[PDB]
Amino acid sequence: XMKXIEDKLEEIXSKXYHXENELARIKXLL
Amino acid sequence: XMKXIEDKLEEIXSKXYHXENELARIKXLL
Amino acid sequence: XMKXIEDKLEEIXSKXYHXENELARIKXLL
Amino acid sequence: XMKXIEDKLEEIXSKXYHXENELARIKXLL
């Protein structure tokens, strides 16, 4: 439930690495 | 409340697909 | 605390509009 | 646990500044 919630938050803190890095891809092409 | 919170987290884990894919649109145009 | 958490989640579901729309700006310029 | 969760939410409300600003980098190059 809470350890569910805290371990989404730690999927979101992945998507927010893969956010930063595939922005930093485009920022490459430009 | 908690099943509210855990099912936002699963809206955020949509916006973080539509994040990855409409980055991967731009990364198309370039 | 929980109504704190559920109303960040509803700041994140703003930043994830302003995510979608300022991607959809760049996707404008291209 | 909850003060864990509320202080990820406040890592996510960083990554969602560094989101807005490194979009607003690309939106610079274009």
Short mmCIF file of N, CA, C and O in Angstrom, two decimals:
data_model
loop_
_atom_site.label_atom_id
_atom_site.label_comp_id
_atom_site.label_asym_id
_atom_site.label_seq_id
_atom_site.Cartn_x
_atom_site.Cartn_y
_atom_site.Cartn_z
N UNK A 1 1.62 -2.02 0.00
CA UNK A 1 0.00 0.00 0.00
C UNK A 1 0.95 1.18 0.00
O UNK A 1 1.08 1.92 -0.97
N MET A 2 1.60 1.33 1.14
CA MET A 2 2.58 2.39 1.41
C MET A 2 4.01 2.06 0.93
O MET A 2 4.73 2.96 0.49
N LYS A 3 4.43 0.80 1.07
CA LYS A 3 5.75 0.35 0.59
C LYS A 3 5.66 0.21 -0.92
O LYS A 3 6.53 0.70 -1.63
N UNK A 4 4.61 -0.44 -1.42
CA UNK A 4 3.26 0.23 -3.46
C UNK A 4 3.60 1.69 -3.73
O UNK A 4 4.34 1.99 -4.62
N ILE A 5 3.05 2.59 -2.94
CA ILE A 5 3.31 4.01 -3.11
C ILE A 5 4.79 4.38 -3.10
O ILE A 5 5.27 4.97 -4.06
N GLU A 6 5.54 4.05 -2.06
CA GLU A 6 6.93 4.54 -1.96
C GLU A 6 7.87 3.91 -3.01
O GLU A 6 8.85 4.56 -3.40
N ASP A 7 7.57 2.67 -3.45
CA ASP A 7 8.38 1.96 -4.45
C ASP A 7 7.32 2.28 -6.74
O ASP A 7 8.12 2.32 -7.67
N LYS A 8 6.22 3.05 -6.70
CA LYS A 8 5.87 4.02 -7.74
C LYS A 8 6.81 5.23 -7.67
O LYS A 8 7.58 5.48 -8.60
N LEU A 9 6.77 5.95 -6.56
CA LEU A 9 7.65 7.10 -6.36
C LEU A 9 9.12 6.82 -6.73
O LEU A 9 9.77 7.68 -7.33
N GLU A 10 9.64 5.64 -6.38
CA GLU A 10 11.03 5.32 -6.70
C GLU A 10 10.78 4.24 -8.97
O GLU A 10 11.70 4.72 -9.64
N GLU A 11 9.58 3.92 -9.50
CA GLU A 11 9.26 4.11 -10.94
C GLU A 11 9.34 5.56 -11.43
O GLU A 11 9.86 5.81 -12.51
N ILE A 12 8.87 6.52 -10.64
CA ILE A 12 8.85 7.91 -11.09
C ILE A 12 10.21 8.56 -10.96
O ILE A 12 10.62 9.28 -11.84
N UNK A 13 10.92 8.32 -9.88
CA UNK A 13 12.25 8.93 -9.71
C UNK A 13 13.77 7.53 -11.38
O UNK A 13 14.62 8.17 -11.97
N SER A 14 13.14 6.49 -11.91
CA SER A 14 13.39 6.00 -13.26
C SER A 14 12.94 6.90 -14.42
O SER A 14 13.76 7.37 -15.20
N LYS A 15 11.64 7.12 -14.54
CA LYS A 15 11.11 7.93 -15.64
C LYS A 15 11.58 9.38 -15.54
O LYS A 15 11.83 9.99 -16.55
N UNK A 16 11.69 9.93 -14.34
CA UNK A 16 12.13 11.33 -14.19
C UNK A 16 14.63 11.02 -14.59
O UNK A 16 14.73 11.68 -15.61
N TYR A 17 15.45 10.00 -14.27
CA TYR A 17 16.56 9.59 -15.13
C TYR A 17 16.24 9.55 -16.63
O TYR A 17 16.87 10.29 -17.40
N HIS A 18 15.31 8.70 -17.06
CA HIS A 18 15.17 8.44 -18.49
C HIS A 18 14.67 9.65 -19.26
O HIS A 18 15.23 10.02 -20.29
N UNK A 19 13.61 10.24 -18.76
CA UNK A 19 13.18 12.64 -18.51
C UNK A 19 14.51 13.31 -18.76
O UNK A 19 14.86 13.66 -19.87
N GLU A 20 15.27 13.49 -17.70
CA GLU A 20 16.57 14.12 -17.78
C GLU A 20 17.51 13.72 -18.92
O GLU A 20 18.19 14.59 -19.46
N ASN A 21 17.56 12.44 -19.29
CA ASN A 21 18.60 11.94 -20.21
C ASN A 21 18.23 11.81 -21.69
O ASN A 21 19.04 12.11 -22.57
N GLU A 22 17.03 11.36 -21.96
CA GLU A 22 16.60 11.20 -23.33
C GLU A 22 15.88 13.60 -23.71
O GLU A 22 16.49 13.90 -24.72
N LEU A 23 15.60 14.49 -22.77
CA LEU A 23 16.00 15.91 -22.88
C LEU A 23 17.49 16.16 -23.21
O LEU A 23 17.80 16.94 -24.09
N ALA A 24 18.39 15.52 -22.49
CA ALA A 24 19.83 15.79 -22.62
C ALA A 24 20.44 15.24 -23.91
O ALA A 24 21.34 15.87 -24.46
N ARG A 25 19.95 14.07 -24.38
CA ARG A 25 19.34 13.14 -26.62
C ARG A 25 19.06 14.34 -27.52
O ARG A 25 19.85 14.69 -28.40
N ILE A 26 17.92 14.97 -27.29
CA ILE A 26 17.50 16.14 -28.06
C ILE A 26 18.54 17.28 -27.91
O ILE A 26 19.20 17.64 -28.89
N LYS A 27 18.74 17.79 -26.70
CA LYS A 27 19.72 18.86 -26.43
C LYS A 27 21.05 18.68 -27.15
O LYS A 27 21.61 19.67 -27.64
N UNK A 28 21.57 17.43 -27.21
CA UNK A 28 22.76 15.93 -28.85
C UNK A 28 22.46 16.33 -30.30
O UNK A 28 23.34 16.82 -31.03
N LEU A 29 21.20 16.12 -30.70
CA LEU A 29 20.74 16.45 -32.05
C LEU A 29 20.75 17.96 -32.39
O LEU A 29 20.74 18.32 -33.59
N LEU A 30 20.81 18.82 -31.37
CA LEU A 30 20.71 20.29 -31.55
C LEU A 30 21.96 21.11 -31.19
O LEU A 30 22.16 22.18 -31.75
N UNK B 1 -9.20 7.05 -1.14
CA UNK B 1 -7.41 8.49 0.06
C UNK B 1 -6.11 7.90 -0.45
O UNK B 1 -5.37 8.50 -1.21
N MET B 2 -5.87 6.68 0.01
CA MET B 2 -4.69 5.88 -0.33
C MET B 2 -4.83 5.08 -1.64
O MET B 2 -3.84 4.91 -2.36
N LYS B 3 -6.02 4.54 -1.91
CA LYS B 3 -6.30 3.81 -3.15
C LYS B 3 -6.45 4.84 -4.26
O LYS B 3 -5.86 4.69 -5.32
N UNK B 4 -7.24 5.89 -4.01
CA UNK B 4 -6.78 8.29 -4.65
C UNK B 4 -5.28 8.37 -4.95
O UNK B 4 -4.89 8.42 -6.09
N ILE B 5 -4.46 8.37 -3.92
CA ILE B 5 -3.01 8.43 -4.11
C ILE B 5 -2.45 7.34 -5.02
O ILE B 5 -1.81 7.66 -6.01
N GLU B 6 -2.67 6.07 -4.73
CA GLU B 6 -2.01 5.01 -5.52
C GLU B 6 -2.51 4.91 -6.97
O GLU B 6 -1.74 4.50 -7.84
N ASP B 7 -3.79 5.30 -7.22
CA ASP B 7 -4.38 5.25 -8.56
C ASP B 7 -4.22 7.58 -9.59
O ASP B 7 -4.08 7.57 -10.81
N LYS B 8 -3.60 8.46 -8.79
CA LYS B 8 -2.69 9.50 -9.28
C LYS B 8 -1.38 8.87 -9.74
O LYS B 8 -1.03 8.92 -10.91
N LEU B 9 -0.66 8.25 -8.81
CA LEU B 9 0.60 7.58 -9.12
C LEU B 9 0.52 6.69 -10.37
O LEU B 9 1.45 6.68 -11.18
N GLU B 10 -0.58 5.94 -10.54
CA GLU B 10 -0.72 5.07 -11.70
C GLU B 10 -1.83 6.61 -13.36
O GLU B 10 -1.24 6.40 -14.42
N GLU B 11 -2.31 7.83 -13.01
CA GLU B 11 -2.18 9.02 -13.89
C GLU B 11 -0.73 9.43 -14.20
O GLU B 11 -0.42 9.76 -15.33
N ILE B 12 0.16 9.38 -13.21
CA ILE B 12 1.53 9.83 -13.43
C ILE B 12 2.36 8.79 -14.16
O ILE B 12 3.12 9.13 -15.03
N UNK B 13 2.22 7.52 -13.81
CA UNK B 13 3.00 6.47 -14.48
C UNK B 13 1.81 6.27 -16.84
O UNK B 13 2.55 6.07 -17.80
N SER B 14 0.69 6.98 -16.93
CA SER B 14 0.22 7.61 -18.16
C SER B 14 1.05 8.79 -18.68
O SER B 14 1.62 8.73 -19.77
N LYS B 15 1.09 9.88 -17.92
CA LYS B 15 1.82 11.07 -18.35
C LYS B 15 3.32 10.81 -18.45
O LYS B 15 3.95 11.33 -19.33
N UNK B 16 3.89 10.01 -17.57
CA UNK B 16 5.34 9.72 -17.62
C UNK B 16 5.36 8.06 -19.56
O UNK B 16 6.02 8.72 -20.35
N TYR B 17 4.46 7.12 -19.93
CA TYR B 17 4.19 6.81 -21.33
C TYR B 17 4.10 8.01 -22.27
O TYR B 17 4.91 8.12 -23.20
N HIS B 18 3.13 8.90 -22.06
CA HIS B 18 2.85 9.91 -23.09
C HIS B 18 3.97 10.92 -23.26
O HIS B 18 4.41 11.20 -24.37
N UNK B 19 4.42 11.46 -22.14
CA UNK B 19 6.74 11.87 -21.48
C UNK B 19 7.59 11.09 -22.48
O UNK B 19 7.97 11.59 -23.52
N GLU B 20 7.87 9.86 -22.14
CA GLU B 20 8.67 8.99 -22.99
C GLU B 20 8.39 8.97 -24.49
O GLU B 20 9.34 8.91 -25.26
N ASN B 21 7.13 9.05 -24.91
CA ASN B 21 6.77 8.80 -26.32
C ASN B 21 6.57 10.03 -27.22
O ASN B 21 6.98 10.02 -28.39
N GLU B 22 5.96 11.06 -26.69
CA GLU B 22 5.74 12.26 -27.47
C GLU B 22 8.03 13.30 -27.11
O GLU B 22 8.39 13.53 -28.24
N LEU B 23 8.87 13.00 -26.13
CA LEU B 23 10.33 12.91 -26.36
C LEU B 23 10.78 12.03 -27.54
O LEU B 23 11.58 12.45 -28.35
N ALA B 24 10.27 10.81 -27.63
CA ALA B 24 10.72 9.84 -28.64
C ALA B 24 10.25 10.16 -30.05
O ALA B 24 11.00 9.90 -31.00
N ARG B 25 9.02 10.71 -30.18
CA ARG B 25 8.01 12.53 -31.59
C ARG B 25 9.15 13.44 -31.99
O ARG B 25 9.60 13.46 -33.14
N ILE B 26 9.63 14.23 -31.03
CA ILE B 26 10.73 15.16 -31.26
C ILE B 26 11.99 14.40 -31.72
O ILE B 26 12.44 14.58 -32.85
N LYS B 27 12.53 13.52 -30.87
CA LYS B 27 13.73 12.72 -31.21
C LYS B 27 13.72 12.16 -32.64
O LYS B 27 14.77 12.16 -33.29
N UNK B 28 12.55 11.68 -33.12
CA UNK B 28 11.21 11.68 -35.25
C UNK B 28 11.56 12.89 -36.13
O UNK B 28 12.15 12.75 -37.21
N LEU B 29 11.18 14.07 -35.64
CA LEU B 29 11.44 15.34 -36.35
C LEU B 29 12.94 15.71 -36.49
O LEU B 29 13.29 16.53 -37.36
N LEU B 30 13.81 15.09 -35.68
CA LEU B 30 15.24 15.44 -35.63
C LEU B 30 16.23 14.35 -36.10
O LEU B 30 17.31 14.67 -36.57
N UNK C 1 -1.65 16.92 5.68
CA UNK C 1 0.02 14.94 5.56
C UNK C 1 -0.40 14.23 4.29
O UNK C 1 0.30 14.23 3.28
N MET C 2 -1.57 13.62 4.39
CA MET C 2 -2.21 12.86 3.31
C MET C 2 -3.03 13.73 2.33
O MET C 2 -3.07 13.44 1.13
N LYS C 3 -3.72 14.75 2.85
CA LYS C 3 -4.49 15.68 2.02
C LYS C 3 -3.50 16.63 1.36
O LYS C 3 -3.57 16.86 0.16
N UNK C 4 -2.56 17.18 2.14
CA UNK C 4 -0.12 17.49 1.55
C UNK C 4 0.15 16.56 0.36
O UNK C 4 0.24 17.01 -0.75
N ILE C 5 0.26 15.28 0.62
CA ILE C 5 0.52 14.31 -0.44
C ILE C 5 -0.49 14.37 -1.59
O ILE C 5 -0.09 14.56 -2.73
N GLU C 6 -1.78 14.21 -1.33
CA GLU C 6 -2.75 14.11 -2.45
C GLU C 6 -2.92 15.42 -3.23
O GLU C 6 -3.23 15.36 -4.43
N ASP C 7 -2.71 16.58 -2.57
CA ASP C 7 -2.84 17.90 -3.21
C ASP C 7 -0.53 18.69 -3.92
O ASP C 7 -0.52 19.37 -4.93
N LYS C 8 0.43 17.79 -3.63
CA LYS C 8 1.59 17.53 -4.50
C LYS C 8 1.13 16.77 -5.75
O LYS C 8 1.22 17.28 -6.86
N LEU C 9 0.63 15.56 -5.55
CA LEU C 9 0.13 14.75 -6.66
C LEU C 9 -0.78 15.52 -7.63
O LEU C 9 -0.67 15.34 -8.84
N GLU C 10 -1.67 16.38 -7.11
CA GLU C 10 -2.56 17.15 -7.97
C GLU C 10 -1.19 19.22 -8.40
O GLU C 10 -1.32 19.44 -9.60
N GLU C 11 -0.04 19.49 -7.73
CA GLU C 11 1.15 20.08 -8.39
C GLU C 11 1.74 19.23 -9.52
O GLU C 11 2.11 19.77 -10.55
N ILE C 12 1.82 17.92 -9.34
CA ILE C 12 2.45 17.07 -10.35
C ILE C 12 1.52 16.81 -11.52
O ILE C 12 1.95 16.83 -12.65
N UNK C 13 0.25 16.55 -11.28
CA UNK C 13 -0.69 16.29 -12.37
C UNK C 13 -1.07 18.70 -13.42
O UNK C 13 -1.17 18.73 -14.64
N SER C 14 -0.51 19.67 -12.71
CA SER C 14 0.05 20.89 -13.30
C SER C 14 1.32 20.72 -14.13
O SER C 14 1.33 20.99 -15.33
N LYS C 15 2.41 20.31 -13.49
CA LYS C 15 3.68 20.17 -14.19
C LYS C 15 3.62 19.07 -15.25
O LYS C 15 4.22 19.23 -16.29
N UNK C 16 2.91 17.99 -15.01
CA UNK C 16 2.82 16.90 -16.00
C UNK C 16 1.16 17.97 -17.63
O UNK C 16 1.90 18.05 -18.60
N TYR C 17 0.11 18.78 -17.41
CA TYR C 17 -0.25 19.86 -18.33
C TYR C 17 0.93 20.66 -18.89
O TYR C 17 1.13 20.67 -20.11
N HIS C 18 1.69 21.35 -18.04
CA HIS C 18 2.64 22.34 -18.55
C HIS C 18 3.79 21.71 -19.32
O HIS C 18 4.11 22.13 -20.43
N UNK C 19 4.39 20.70 -18.72
CA UNK C 19 5.11 18.57 -19.67
C UNK C 19 4.44 18.49 -21.04
O UNK C 19 4.98 18.93 -22.04
N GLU C 20 3.26 17.93 -21.06
CA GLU C 20 2.50 17.79 -22.29
C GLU C 20 2.44 18.97 -23.26
O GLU C 20 2.50 18.74 -24.47
N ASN C 21 2.34 20.20 -22.76
CA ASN C 21 2.04 21.36 -23.62
C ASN C 21 3.22 22.22 -24.09
O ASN C 21 3.26 22.67 -25.24
N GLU C 22 4.17 22.44 -23.21
CA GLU C 22 5.32 23.24 -23.56
C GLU C 22 6.66 21.39 -24.67
O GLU C 22 6.93 21.87 -25.75
N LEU C 23 6.48 20.09 -24.49
CA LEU C 23 6.59 19.13 -25.61
C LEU C 23 5.76 19.46 -26.87
O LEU C 23 6.28 19.43 -27.97
N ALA C 24 4.49 19.78 -26.71
CA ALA C 24 3.58 19.99 -27.85
C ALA C 24 3.82 21.29 -28.60
O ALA C 24 3.66 21.32 -29.82
N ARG C 25 4.21 22.36 -27.86
CA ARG C 25 5.86 24.23 -28.13
C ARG C 25 6.92 23.72 -29.10
O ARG C 25 6.99 24.13 -30.26
N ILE C 26 7.77 22.82 -28.61
CA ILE C 26 8.84 22.24 -29.41
C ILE C 26 8.25 21.50 -30.64
O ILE C 26 8.48 21.92 -31.77
N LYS C 27 7.45 20.45 -30.41
CA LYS C 27 6.82 19.69 -31.51
C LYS C 27 6.25 20.56 -32.63
O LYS C 27 6.39 20.19 -33.81
N UNK C 28 5.62 21.70 -32.29
CA UNK C 28 5.43 24.10 -33.05
C UNK C 28 6.66 24.53 -33.85
O UNK C 28 6.60 24.76 -35.06
N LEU C 29 7.79 24.62 -33.13
CA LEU C 29 9.07 25.02 -33.73
C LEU C 29 9.64 24.02 -34.78
O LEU C 29 10.49 24.41 -35.60
N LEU C 30 9.14 22.78 -34.77
CA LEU C 30 9.68 21.70 -35.63
C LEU C 30 8.73 21.14 -36.70
O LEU C 30 9.19 20.66 -37.73
N UNK D 1 9.17 7.84 6.82
CA UNK D 1 7.43 6.45 5.50
C UNK D 1 6.67 7.51 4.74
O UNK D 1 6.75 7.64 3.53
N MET D 2 5.91 8.27 5.52
CA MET D 2 5.07 9.37 5.05
C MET D 2 5.81 10.72 4.90
O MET D 2 5.51 11.49 3.99
N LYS D 3 6.73 11.01 5.82
CA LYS D 3 7.55 12.22 5.76
C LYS D 3 8.62 12.00 4.69
O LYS D 3 8.82 12.86 3.85
N UNK D 4 9.29 10.85 4.73
CA UNK D 4 9.91 9.42 2.74
C UNK D 4 9.03 9.89 1.59
O UNK D 4 9.48 10.58 0.71
N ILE D 5 7.77 9.50 1.61
CA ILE D 5 6.84 9.90 0.55
C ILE D 5 6.75 11.41 0.33
O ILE D 5 6.99 11.86 -0.78
N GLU D 6 6.43 12.19 1.35
CA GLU D 6 6.19 13.64 1.11
C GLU D 6 7.46 14.41 0.73
O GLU D 6 7.35 15.42 0.01
N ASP D 7 8.64 13.95 1.19
CA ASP D 7 9.93 14.60 0.89
C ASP D 7 11.02 13.40 -1.07
O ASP D 7 11.69 14.12 -1.79
N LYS D 8 10.26 12.39 -1.54
CA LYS D 8 10.15 12.06 -2.97
C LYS D 8 9.32 13.13 -3.69
O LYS D 8 9.83 13.84 -4.55
N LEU D 9 8.06 13.25 -3.31
CA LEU D 9 7.18 14.26 -3.89
C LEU D 9 7.82 15.66 -3.99
O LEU D 9 7.64 16.34 -5.00
N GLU D 10 8.56 16.08 -2.95
CA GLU D 10 9.19 17.39 -2.98
C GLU D 10 11.42 16.85 -4.01
O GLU D 10 11.62 17.76 -4.82
N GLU D 11 11.85 15.58 -4.22
CA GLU D 11 12.59 15.17 -5.44
C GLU D 11 11.82 15.37 -6.75
O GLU D 11 12.39 15.82 -7.73
N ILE D 12 10.53 15.06 -6.77
CA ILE D 12 9.77 15.15 -8.01
C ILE D 12 9.37 16.58 -8.33
O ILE D 12 9.45 16.98 -9.46
N UNK D 13 8.95 17.35 -7.35
CA UNK D 13 8.56 18.74 -7.60
C UNK D 13 10.89 19.96 -7.96
O UNK D 13 10.91 20.83 -8.82
N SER D 14 11.93 19.18 -7.69
CA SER D 14 13.21 19.27 -8.40
C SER D 14 13.21 18.83 -9.87
O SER D 14 13.47 19.63 -10.77
N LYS D 15 12.95 17.55 -10.11
CA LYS D 15 12.97 17.03 -11.47
C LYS D 15 11.88 17.65 -12.34
O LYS D 15 12.10 17.88 -13.50
N UNK D 16 10.70 17.91 -11.78
CA UNK D 16 9.61 18.51 -12.57
C UNK D 16 10.44 20.93 -12.65
O UNK D 16 10.61 21.00 -13.86
N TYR D 17 11.11 21.66 -11.75
CA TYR D 17 12.12 22.64 -12.13
C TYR D 17 13.07 22.20 -13.25
O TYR D 17 13.09 22.84 -14.31
N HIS D 18 13.86 21.15 -13.03
CA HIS D 18 14.96 20.87 -13.95
C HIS D 18 14.48 20.44 -15.33
O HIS D 18 14.93 20.95 -16.35
N UNK D 19 13.57 19.49 -15.34
CA UNK D 19 11.54 19.34 -16.70
C UNK D 19 11.37 20.71 -17.32
O UNK D 19 11.87 21.00 -18.39
N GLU D 20 10.66 21.56 -16.62
CA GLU D 20 10.41 22.92 -17.08
C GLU D 20 11.56 23.71 -17.69
O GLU D 20 11.34 24.43 -18.66
N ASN D 21 12.77 23.59 -17.14
CA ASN D 21 13.88 24.50 -17.51
C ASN D 21 14.88 24.00 -18.56
O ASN D 21 15.33 24.77 -19.42
N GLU D 22 15.24 22.74 -18.48
CA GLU D 22 16.18 22.19 -19.42
C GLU D 22 14.52 21.70 -21.27
O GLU D 22 15.02 22.24 -22.23
N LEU D 23 13.20 21.58 -21.13
CA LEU D 23 12.26 22.13 -22.13
C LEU D 23 12.47 23.60 -22.54
O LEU D 23 12.50 23.92 -23.71
N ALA D 24 12.61 24.49 -21.56
CA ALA D 24 12.69 25.93 -21.83
C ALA D 24 14.01 26.37 -22.45
O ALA D 24 14.01 27.29 -23.28
N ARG D 25 15.13 25.72 -22.05
CA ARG D 25 17.20 24.84 -23.17
C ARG D 25 16.83 24.62 -24.63
O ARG D 25 17.23 25.36 -25.53
N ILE D 26 16.05 23.57 -24.87
CA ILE D 26 15.61 23.22 -26.22
C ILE D 26 14.80 24.38 -26.84
O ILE D 26 15.24 24.99 -27.81
N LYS D 27 13.65 24.72 -26.24
CA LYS D 27 12.80 25.83 -26.72
C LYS D 27 13.58 27.08 -27.15
O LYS D 27 13.23 27.70 -28.16
N UNK D 28 14.63 27.45 -26.38
CA UNK D 28 16.98 28.34 -26.65
C UNK D 28 17.56 27.97 -28.02
O UNK D 28 17.78 28.83 -28.88
N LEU D 29 17.81 26.67 -28.19
CA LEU D 29 18.37 26.13 -29.44
C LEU D 29 17.45 26.28 -30.68
O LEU D 29 17.94 26.20 -31.82
N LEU D 30 16.15 26.51 -30.45
CA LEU D 30 15.15 26.55 -31.54
C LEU D 30 14.46 27.91 -31.79
O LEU D 30 14.04 28.17 -32.92
#
